[PDB]
Amino acid sequence: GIVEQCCTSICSLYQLENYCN
Amino acid sequence: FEDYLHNVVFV
Amino acid sequence: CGSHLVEALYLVCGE
Amino acid sequence: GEVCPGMDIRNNLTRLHELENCSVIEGHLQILLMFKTRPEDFRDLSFPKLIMITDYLLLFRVYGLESLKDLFPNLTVIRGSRLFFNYALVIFEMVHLKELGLYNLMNITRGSVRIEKNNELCYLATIDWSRILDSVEDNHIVLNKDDNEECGDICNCPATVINGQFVERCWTHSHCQKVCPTICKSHGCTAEGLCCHSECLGNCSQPDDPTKCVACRNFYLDGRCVETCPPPYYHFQDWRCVNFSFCQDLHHKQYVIHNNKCIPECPSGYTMNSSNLLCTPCLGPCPK
Amino acid sequence: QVQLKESGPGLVAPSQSLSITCTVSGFPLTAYGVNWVRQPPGKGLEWLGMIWGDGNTDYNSALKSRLSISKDNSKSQVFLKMNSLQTDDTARYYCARDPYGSKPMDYWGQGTSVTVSS
Amino acid sequence: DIVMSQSPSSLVVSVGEKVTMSCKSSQSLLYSSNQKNFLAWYQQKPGQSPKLLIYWASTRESGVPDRFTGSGSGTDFTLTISSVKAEDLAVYYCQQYFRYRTFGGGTKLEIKRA
Ligand SMILES: *[C@@H]1O[C@H](CO)[C@@H](O[C@@H]2O[C@H](CO)[C@@H](O[C@@H]3O[C@H](CO)[C@@H](O)[C@H](O[C@H]4O[C@H](CO)[C@@H](O)[C@H](O)[C@@H]4O)[C@@H]3O)[C@H](O)[C@H]2NC(C)=O)[C@H](O)[C@H]1NC(C)=O
Ligand SMILES: *[C@@H]1O[C@H](CO)[C@@H](O[C@@H]2O[C@H](CO)[C@@H](O[C@@H]3O[C@H](CO)[C@@H](O)[C@H](O)[C@@H]3O)[C@H](O)[C@H]2NC(C)=O)[C@H](O)[C@H]1NC(C)=O
Ligand SMILES: *[C@@H]1O[C@H](CO)[C@@H](O)[C@H](O)[C@H]1NC(C)=O
Ligand SMILES: *[C@@H]1O[C@H](CO)[C@@H](O)[C@H](O)[C@H]1NC(C)=O
Ligand SMILES: *[C@@H]1O[C@H](CO)[C@@H](O)[C@H](O)[C@H]1NC(C)=O
């Protein structure tokens, strides 16, 4: 998940916003 | 494990 | 890159 | 007290008060991701009613929390029925934690302990985990203040030998680690060292009485610690006895009955007969 | 300090009812079950019924509504009531504790003798 | 309903010898969830009340001499008295506590003496 989406693979701000509490 | 931790604690 | 996603995830959040 | 379900507390401390009347959490307890909390928010905060967690305890990124001695002073057993990647206890990236302070923690049925990446964390080397977990082999206690020779740990306390040397055992400056004689096993004991009843788990309010346990090694029913649920009761969540009606009420929006247990789902080779919640085996291959 | 004692009437006239109070001490009725067993002179043990911690009831099938077992938890008393006794109901009646989940009938009362005749 | 049946109705033996009596239930008393048999053995000395000796068909009650050995599984059971002592004179009963509770007809133990 987040560990594969934003770690091995490099993330973007939009994806980070999408996750947001 | 920090891997598991994130993959689990994250929606 | 673990610790960083914790920092970065907060950056983005605020709530 | 009360049985509450598994809880997931994040961001704000507001939801934490949902645990106020709670005795047993049937499921897990996760308290995490509190970035704006400060020490003052925890000076007045306590859940002395919590005695047991059926699954696991996880603390991660809770800022301003310095000890758990005031938060969970009476947590005695973590049963580890379900675990967080083999762990029943996880203390991770607890920036600000100075000590564990779970001075009432007597037994971790099942799991292992993972205490990692806690800058400021001391009072770890003072804990004999062999008194709490059967298997300490799988404990992963790394990268804490404790690893870097300069913890000023101070404990009267009973000493035990882990490596080659005997070391005094305690949780905080003011709380020793309780050690019960060898013969008490997991049943716990009184201050005087008198073993609790064999059906008790970590402690008891009176010795030699299965109605006076503060835990239950096996199952709980109608005040008492019992070896097994007698029929017409079913084994539930690996700690309590319930009747068919309870299991039925739950199912009706998916609990099933199998081998005298009220279980989440039917095991392999079985499917659920609809009118009686009973797992029955499959005539030919299993529909799923 | 586990004790059970039966307080019976001793004599019952045929067609009349039998009322026995089992007075228990040393444990709470809320956490344990209480059974009733009878023994006709020189004969075996007959299980009559039980009352579980939750007040749930179990009766020997033979007792077609003649038997009632109730209790008062606060007074540590268990009540047996049996309607229309006959000569064949002449026996010693015992109440015995039951730690249900964990053990079978531990701790028996000394018993009370019941004679049915006019 | 569960029906319990015992044999013999009575037995006689002299001091020192071993003794075995049997029990039978109309339904299996072996609990799936823990592999335990829901059967008990009681001893009743004459004039006294009965005493619990063995539960779970094999578990010895505390304060019970190792002389008493409970055996059997499913529907068929036996009680053994290793070296009979004078005061072992009594009626022995089997009780199922699987569904409700029911006693067997019991077996009488007599002692052979001069
Ligand atoms: C903490 O307290 C416990 C007493 O509650 C104490 O003893 C340990 O108890 C556990 C639970 O009864 C034992 O674990 C079992 O061991 C058997 C032996 O082979 C296994 O078959 C069991 O497996 C079943 O249950 C598992 C857990 O629910 C399931 O995951 C699995 O699918 C099976 O159904 C089970 O693992 C354990 O063996 C004892 N330990 C001893 C030494 O007897 C424990 O010692 C106390 N801790 C301390 C440090 O005092
Ligand atoms: C099956 O098992 C359950 C779980 O133990 C039993 O639950 C109990 O049932 C009663 C009745 O619903 C519960 O509610 C009561 O309501 C009255 C309302 O006036 C209140 O005064 C009581 O204080 C109580 O709240 C009770 O909470 C609950 N008790 C327990 C121990 O869980 C259920 O009764 C069992 N069913 C049968 C048929 O035996
Ligand atoms: C935090 O708590 C306040 C109430 O004290 C609430 O209004 C707010 O919505 C909470 N935060 C989130 C993210 O829900
Ligand atoms: C705890 O119990 C009291 C009883 O009066 C009640 O007012 C309170 O709201 C309860 N809290 C929770 C979280 O259930
Ligand atoms: C054990 O239980 C007793 C009675 O509730 C209590 O006083 C004591 O603090 C508990 N904990 C320990 C470690 O004995």
Side-chain angles (χ1 to χ4, degrees):
Chain A
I2 189 168
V3 173
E4 293 305 282
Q5 183 195 37
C6 306
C7 207
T8 70
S9 175
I10 292 179
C11 220
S12 56
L13 173 46
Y14 152 65
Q15 282 134 43
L16 258 40
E17 177 316 303
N18 164 46
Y19 254 141
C20 274
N21 312 140
Chain B
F1 169 72
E2 193 164 323
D3 297 333
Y4 181 103
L5 172 77
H6 308 329
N7 273 354
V8 61
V9 184
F10 296 134
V11 173
Chain C
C1 89
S3 177
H4 316 302
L5 175 64
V6 174
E7 313 150 14
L9 177 69
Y10 193 32
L11 257 188
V12 191
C13 290
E15 283 174 4
Chain D
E2 194 62 79
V3 57
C4 322
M7 302 208 165
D8 172 61
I9 315 152
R10 298 161 180 261
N11 316 307
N12 258 344
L13 278 178
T14 72
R15 291 198 61 239
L16 195 54
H17 304 275
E18 290 176 358
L19 291 179
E20 78 177 27
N21 300 313
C22 223
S23 292
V24 172
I25 286 161
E26 188 172 57
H28 65 243
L29 186 50
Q30 289 179 172
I31 310 166
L32 59 86
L33 299 179
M34 293 176 183
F35 301 129
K36 292 150 289 202
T37 43
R38 286 175 156 171
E40 55 182 2
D41 299 71
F42 299 127
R43 295 194 271 101
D44 78 307
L45 209 53
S46 198
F47 301 97
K49 285 181 191 167
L50 187 67
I51 304 126
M52 211 221 310
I53 299 165
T54 310
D55 298 357
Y56 65 78
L57 183 57
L58 162 52
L59 292 320
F60 167 58
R61 295 282 187 177
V62 186
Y63 293 50
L65 191 50
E66 304 185 279
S67 179
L68 306 173
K69 81 181 277 157
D70 291 83
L71 206 53
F72 308 106
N74 295 307
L75 176 65
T76 309
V77 180
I78 302 165
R79 298 189 78 90
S81 40
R82 278 155 224 167
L83 307 162
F84 193 87
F85 177 82
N86 298 42
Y87 310 105
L89 182 64
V90 183
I91 305 292
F92 186 67
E93 295 197 297
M94 289 293 286
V95 188
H96 308 138
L97 202 77
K98 288 181 178 184
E99 58 193 25
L100 286 191
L102 300 164
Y103 66 95
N104 264 55
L105 185 67
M106 286 287 96
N107 183 284
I108 296 154
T109 307
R110 209 142 160 257
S112 298
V113 168
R114 187 132 174 164
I115 299 167
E116 172 156 32
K117 288 174 184 274
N118 311 286
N119 61 337
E120 300 325 314
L121 193 59
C122 289
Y123 283 100
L124 291 180
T126 54
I127 302 161
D128 178 8
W129 292 102
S130 62
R131 292 285 148 264
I132 304 160
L133 303 116
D134 268 336
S135 60
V136 298
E137 289 82 335
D138 317 302
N139 280 359
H140 195 282
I141 317 304
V142 302
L143 307 167
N144 304 301
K145 189 184 172 187
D146 172 65
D147 284 29
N148 346 316
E149 202 189 353
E150 301 214 41
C151 271
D153 291 342
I154 49 108
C155 299
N156 254 313
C157 301
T160 65
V161 62
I162 289 301
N163 286 11
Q165 62 174 50
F166 271 100
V167 174
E168 222 182 303
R169 307 277 179 176
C170 72
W171 289 97
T172 76
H173 57 287
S174 65
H175 300 279
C176 285
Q177 179 188 353
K178 174 143 187 60
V179 175
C180 279
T182 51
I183 34 91
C184 291
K185 297 172 143 52
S186 59
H187 315 115
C189 59
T190 65
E192 296 157 321
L194 305 171
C195 307
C196 282
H197 191 270
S198 55
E199 230 71 63
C200 292
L201 180 68
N203 190 22
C204 56
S205 56
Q206 292 166 44
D208 193 72
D209 194 330
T211 68
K212 247 81 199 185
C213 310
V214 164
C216 296
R217 172 171 130 235
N218 298 300
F219 295 109
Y220 172 78
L221 173 143
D222 301 326
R224 194 181 79 213
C225 298
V226 295
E227 181 184 294
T228 167
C229 298
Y233 307 95
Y234 303 102
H235 299 290
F236 188 66
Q237 197 65 74
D238 258 46
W239 80 286
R240 70 166 163 173
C241 302
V242 297
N243 53 50
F244 174 75
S245 171
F246 171 99
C247 196
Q248 181 124 283
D249 289 355
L250 262 71
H251 179 276
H252 293 103
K253 197 169 155 66
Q254 192 161 338
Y255 287 81
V256 306
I257 289 98
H258 178 66
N259 197 250
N260 298 114
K261 296 134 90 187
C262 175
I263 198 157
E265 249 154 28
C266 269
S268 70
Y270 294 92
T271 183
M272 207 265 294
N273 190 62
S274 323
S275 297
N276 56 348
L277 311 177
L278 300 174
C279 286
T280 60
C282 304
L283 186 143
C286 285
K288 211 216 170 287
Chain E
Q1 286 103 30
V2 181
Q3 287 196 52
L4 300 94
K5 304 181 182 192
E6 310 83 324
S7 66
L11 304 171
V12 174
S15 290
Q16 191 56 66
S17 62
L18 169 63
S19 281
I20 309 164
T21 299
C22 170
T23 52
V24 313
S25 58
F27 69 98
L29 285 176
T30 61
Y32 293 88
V34 168
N35 294 336
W36 290 91
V37 171
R38 76 184 177 179
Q39 187 171 35
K43 289 187 192 275
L45 301 174
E46 188 186 21
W47 185 83
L48 309 177
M50 69 173 287
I51 192 159
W52 295 78
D54 75 344
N56 177 345
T57 57
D58 274 26
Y59 300 127
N60 173 343
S61 46
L63 273 143
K64 287 192 170 172
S65 307
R66 279 166 69 191
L67 183 72
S68 284
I69 307 169
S70 38
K71 63 176 185 162
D72 183 323
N73 63 34
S74 61
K75 301 217 89 165
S76 282
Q77 292 170 232
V78 176
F79 319 104
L80 174 145
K81 188 214 286 184
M82 210 171 96
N83 63 34
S84 188
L85 273 76
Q86 284 208 342
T87 73
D88 54 357
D89 295 302
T90 292
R92 178 164 274 257
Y93 288 70
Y94 308 93
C95 61
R97 185 182 86 167
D98 192 332
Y100 43 100
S102 210
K103 277 197 293 124
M105 297 185 201
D106 72 319
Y107 298 103
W108 292 62
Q110 64 198 1
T112 189
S113 174
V114 176
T115 309
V116 187
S117 190
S118 58
Chain F
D1 188 269
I2 312 180
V3 172
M4 308 303 297
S5 44
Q6 308 185 227
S7 63
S9 48
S10 58
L11 173 77
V12 320
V13 74
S14 195
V15 178
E17 211 199 325
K18 194 170 264 213
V19 158
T20 299
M21 63 209 102
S22 52
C23 180
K24 195 189 85 187
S25 158
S26 53
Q27 190 191 104
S28 176
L29 313 176
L30 171 59
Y31 210 167
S32 61
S33 56
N34 61 332
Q35 310 301 338
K36 297 211 133 228
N37 283 277
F38 276 41
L39 180 286
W41 287 99
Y42 288 83
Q43 160 216 247
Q44 180 183 49
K45 302 187 194 75
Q48 287 179 48
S49 301
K51 171 193 172 187
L52 179 62
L53 296 165
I54 294 163
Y55 59 105
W56 274 320
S58 74
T59 306
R60 212 153 312 182
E61 175 68 293
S62 171
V64 176
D66 318 301
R67 300 206 306 274
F68 302 85
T69 31
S71 6
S73 203
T75 65
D76 295 76
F77 301 82
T78 70
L79 175 64
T80 306
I81 306 153
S82 316
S83 158
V84 174
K85 275 161 202 169
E87 53 181 282
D88 297 340
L89 193 137
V91 186
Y92 296 78
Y93 299 92
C94 73
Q95 180 200 68
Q96 72 81 28
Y97 52 105
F98 194 83
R99 205 57 209 105
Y100 307 89
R101 295 192 174 229
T102 56
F103 284 96
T107 180
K108 174 170 80 194
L109 175 80
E110 288 226 282
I111 294 172
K112 188 187 188 73
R113 68 197 283 163

